[PDB]
Amino acid sequence: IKEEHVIIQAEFYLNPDQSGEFMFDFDGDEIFHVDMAKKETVWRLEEFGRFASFEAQGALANIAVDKANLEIMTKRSNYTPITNVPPEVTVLTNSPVELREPNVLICFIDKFTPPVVNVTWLRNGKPVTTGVSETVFLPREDHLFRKFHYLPFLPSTEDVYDCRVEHWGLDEPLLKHWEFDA
Amino acid sequence: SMGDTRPRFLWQLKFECHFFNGTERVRLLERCIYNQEESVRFDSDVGEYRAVTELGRPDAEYWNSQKDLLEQRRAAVDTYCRHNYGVGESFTVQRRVEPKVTVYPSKNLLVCSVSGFYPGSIEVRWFRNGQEEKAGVVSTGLIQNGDWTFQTLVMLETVPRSGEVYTCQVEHPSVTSPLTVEWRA
Amino acid sequence: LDAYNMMISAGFSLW
C-alpha cells in the first residue's frame, strides 16, 4: 500500500501555439526533457547523461501523434477552449542570504494553465535579460503546471528584485518582490 | 504578436509508473487529458481503457478493440515501469545528498537552516539544554528547489537565557549519525 | 549506457 516512488512520462501539445513538450519526472523532480528546437535530450542534472541514455527521436514521433490527437479532440469537443488558470508565484533563495556571498534567486510559478507564461527578472526595476536559467513546464496531479526560474546573484541592500509574470489568467502582470533585509 | 487572445486547446498524455516496496508492486496509469480534464485512462489494475468523461468514451472503445495495444499496455509494468526503475535506480532512488545545517537568530526566533539535501525525508528537532522543544516550533515546510535538492527552515520561538545551549539536530538518510549545530547565548 | 524506455502515444480513430 506504501507508495515509494513515481516515474511520470509527461507530454503535451498546445494549439494554436504549436508548442510541445516531452519530459520524465521522478518523485516530482525532472529527470530530462526533449528540447523541441534542438531536438535533443536535456538531462536536468548534467551527470545523468553519464549514467543513462534516452533516444529523443521517439519523443518527437509521439509529439506528432499528440498533435493529431489534439486536433481530433478539439473538433470532438465542439472547439471548447481551455479555461485560463492564473499562476501563483513565490520568490525564494537557494540558501540563507549573506552580503555579497553568491546565491541564487528562485522564482517558482505554480498552479497555472495553459503552459505559456512570460517571466522576467527585474533588478531595481530593470529587466535582467541574461543569466537566467529556467525549467520546462513541470506537471501537476491536477493537470496544471509549475516552473522554476533561477538568477545567480550577489546579495546587496542596493538591489531589489521582482519576478514579473505574465499569463492569460492574470488581469495584470504579477510582480513578486524580494529584498535583502540586512 | 501583441493582442494574442486566441482560444487555446491543450492535450496532455501522462504515463505514471507507481512503485511500492521496490518493484515488488507496480501500477501503470496512462492518462489522457484535454484542457484540464482527464477523459480516458488505462489502469494496469484494470487491464483495459476506461472513459473518465463521456468525451473520452469513443477512444476507450476504439483502443479496447486493439489486441496489440492492449497487450503492449498490459506488459508495460515490466517492459516500461520496472525497466526504467532499474535504469535510474543508482542516481535517483539511491541518490543521497547531505544537507548543510546552520543556526542563526532572526532579529526571539532561532532559525535552523537545512539546505541542499536529498531525498526529502528528514527529521529536524530542537533541543534546549538537551530537552526537546516542540510547542514553539514552526517551519517553512519541505521546499523543493527544482534541482534535485530540498531545503527547509525549522524555527524555535524562545526567550534565551545566559548559559542555555540550544541544539538543532538533523536526521537524514545521507548520514549515519545525526548532524548537530549548537547556539549558545 | 542503459536507456529509458518510452510509451508510444496511441492514435485516435479518424472516423
In chain B, where the domains are located: 1-94, 95-185
Q: How far apart are CA B174 and CA B80, in angstroms?
A: 29
What is the number of alpha carbons within 13 Å of residue B107 lying toward its C-beta? 3
Inter-chain residue contact C10 with B58, CB threshold 8 Å: no
Question: Which amino acid makes up residue A113?
Answer: T
Q: How far apart are CA B117 and CA B100, in angstroms?
A: 8
For the stretch A38-43, contacts whose Cβ atoms lie closer than 8 Å and that sit 24 or more positions apart, written own/partner, are none
Chain B residues whose CB is inside 8 A of the A26 CB are 88, 92
Inter-chain residue contact C3 with A61, CB threshold 8 Å: no
C-alpha distance from residue A28 to each of A147, B64, B105, B148, B150 (Å) = 12, 31, 32, 9, 11
Q: What is residue A31's three-state secondary structure?
A: strand
Where does chain A show beta strands of DSSP type E? 3-15, 19-26, 29-35, 40-43, 88-93, 103-112, 118-123, 126-127, 133-134, 138-139, 145-153, 161-166, 174-178
Q: Name the interface residues of C facing A (CB cutoff 8 Å).
A: 1-4, 6-12, 14
Q: Shortest CB distance from C1 goes to which of A24, A53, A59?
A: A53
Q: Are A14 and B8 in contact (CB under 8 A)?
A: yes
Give the mutation candidate from A7, A8, A9, A32 for the C interface (greatest C CB count, under 10 A): A9
Q: Shortest CB distance from A62 goes to which of C2, C9, C12?
A: C9
Q: Shortest CB distance from C9 goes to which of A52, A55, A69?
A: A69
Q: Which residues, 6+ apart, have CB-to-CB distance to A43 below 8 Å?
A: A31, A32, A49
Q: What is the 3-state secondary structure (H, E, C) of chain B?
A: CCCCCCCCEEEEEEEEEEEECCCCEEEEEEEEEECCEEEEEEECCCCCEEECCHHHHHHHHHHHCCHHHHHHHHHHHHHHHHHHHHHHHHHCCCCCECCEEEEEEECCEEEEEEEEEECCCCEEEEEECCEEECCCEEECCCEECCCCCEEEEEEEECCCCCCCEEEEEEECCCCCCCEEEEEEC
Q: How far apart are CA B91 and CA B89, in angstroms?
A: 6
CA A63, A65, A68: angle at the middle one, nearest 5?
Answer: 110
Inter-chain residue contact C9 with B13, CB threshold 8 Å: yes
Phi, psi of B87 (to 5 degrees): -55, -50
Q: Are B154 and B137 in contact (CB under 8 A)?
A: yes
Q: Shortest CB distance from A73 goes to which of B19, B34, B91?
A: B34
Elucidated via: X-ray
Residue boundaries of the structural domains of chain A: 1-81, 82-182
Q: Shortest CB distance from C1 goes to which of A31, A52, A65?
A: A52
> C15 to chain A nearest CA, in Å?
10
User: Cell for A64?
Assistant: 506528432
Chain B residues whose CB is inside 8 A of the A6 CB are 16-19
Which ranges in chain A belong to alpha helices (H)? 56-76
**Which residues does residue B42 pair with via DSSP β-bridges, in sequence order?**
B30, B49
Give the mutation candidate from C8, C9, C14, C15 for the A interface (greatest A CB count, under 10 A): C9
What is the number of alpha carbons within 13 Å of residue A177 lying toward its C-beta? 7
Q: How far apart are CA B34 and CA B17, in angstroms?
A: 21
A68 touches chain B (CB under 8 A): no
Give the mutation candidate from C6, C7, C12 for the B interface (greatest B CB count, under 10 A): C7
Q: Are B178 and B170 in contact (CB under 8 A)?
A: yes
C-alpha distance from residue B126 to each of B112, B116, B139, B165, B171 (Å) = 9, 19, 12, 11, 12
B79 touches chain C (CB under 8 A): yes
